[PDB]
């Protein structure tokens, strides 16, 4: 009989790295909601809005950077991803993930992950809406979800990041609207915001499979 697959594969941050990022994420949301530029534009996003409340679904376990959602084999391309030599070799192995930005949209809040070439070997080739189908390099939408609005799915986060990076690719980033302690704040319109970190945040994570 066939072995079924994980619910998903990905890099699971260590306890310390997950907590560090979770805290940084929450501080960004607090700082962003307090920011004059954010308060000004509040009409294109949805007394002040507490974004920690707004993103009212948060990952309950450790934070992670998903590679391939498999749904135990039920997802397209799951078996082909899982049988890869590099996935088997990397299973249980520790990696460093670099985070270059934090972002918010009306649907999601996340961290942008900039994968190394080694790590891109674990990035699936068969994603719906791959980076390449928008002229972005593969794995450009790698992320760690920090929170979701109530009616949103965690998947949305990668789509939101791709849309943000499409825009930044058009150079439509705009002058920074603010200088937060850990970087420059950009208003991308339509309720989309990016904090571009002065120093990339490195987190430690283990590549493996989650079954729930
Ligand atoms: N097509 C899909 N359907 C469900 N979850 C997906 C998915 N693609 C990626 N994921 C990720 O798999 C995990 C379980 O649902 C979530 O963390 C989720 O989003 P995330 O990577 O943005 O957090
Ligand atoms: Cl891709």
Author numbering: 161 to 206, 213 to 378
Sentences from the paper on this structure:
2′,3′-cyclic nucleotide 3′-phosphodiesterase (CNPase) comprises 4% of total myelin protein in the central nervous system (CNS), being the most abundant CNS non-compact myelin protein4. CNPase consists of an N-terminal polynucleotide kinase-like domain10, a catalytic phosphodiesterase domain11, and a membrane-anchored C-terminal tail, which contains a cysteine residue that undergoes isoprenylation. The catalytic domain enables the rapid hydrolysis of nucleoside 2′,3′-cyclic phosphates to nucleoside 2′-phosphates. The CNPase catalytic site, lying in a groove between two lobes, has pseudo two-fold symmetry and contains two apposing His-X-Thr-X (X denotes a hydrophobic residue) motifs, characteristic for 2H phosphoesterases 113537.
The complex with adenosine 2′-monophosphate (2′-AMP) reveals that the R307Q mutant binds the product in a mixed conformation, whereby only the phosphate position changes, and the β5-α7 loop also presents a linked double open/closed conformation. While Arg307 can be assumed to mainly affect ligand binding affinity, its mode of action is not entirely clear, as Arg307 makes no direct interactions with active site ligands in crystal structures. Arg307 may be important for active-site electrostatics, likely playing a role in attracting substrates to bind. In the substrate complex, Arg307 is positioned towards the active site, like in the wild-type CNPcat apo structure, whereas in R307Q, Gln307 is turned away – quite similarly to Arg307 in P296G complexed with 2′-AMP (see next paragraph), and notably, in the sulphate complex determined earlier, where wild-type CNPcat coordinates a sulphate ion at the nearby anion binding pocket. Gln307 similarly coordinates a chloride ion in the anion binding pocket, together with Trp289 and the backbone amide of Gly305.
